Design a protein around this nucleic acid. Structure first.
Length: 32
DNA sequence: CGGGTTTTTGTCTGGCTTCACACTTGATTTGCATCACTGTGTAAGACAGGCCAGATCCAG
């Protein structure tokens, strides 16, 4: 379940995918 | 009988290696079965039997 919501958010903010470094601090304000 | 606080880990995430993987055929190299033999078995003791010797007995 920890990956489903992340994949949905990835589709979300990717429909608007090679930058994993600047994505580190994105999930901090999502699961909270 | 189960609340705190670090360990112990598989991932999420997508993008970079170094090895993995279809075909030949003619060798070339290993692996394994087969066959006629080998050594270690290895010195004394028990018992019957013929043979004289000498003791055991016989009779004038």
């Amino acid at each position: 379940s920890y990956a489903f919501f992340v994949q949905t958010c990835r589709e979300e903010h990717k429909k608007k995918s090679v930058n994993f470094s600047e994505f580190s601090k994105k999930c901090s304000e999502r699961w909270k």
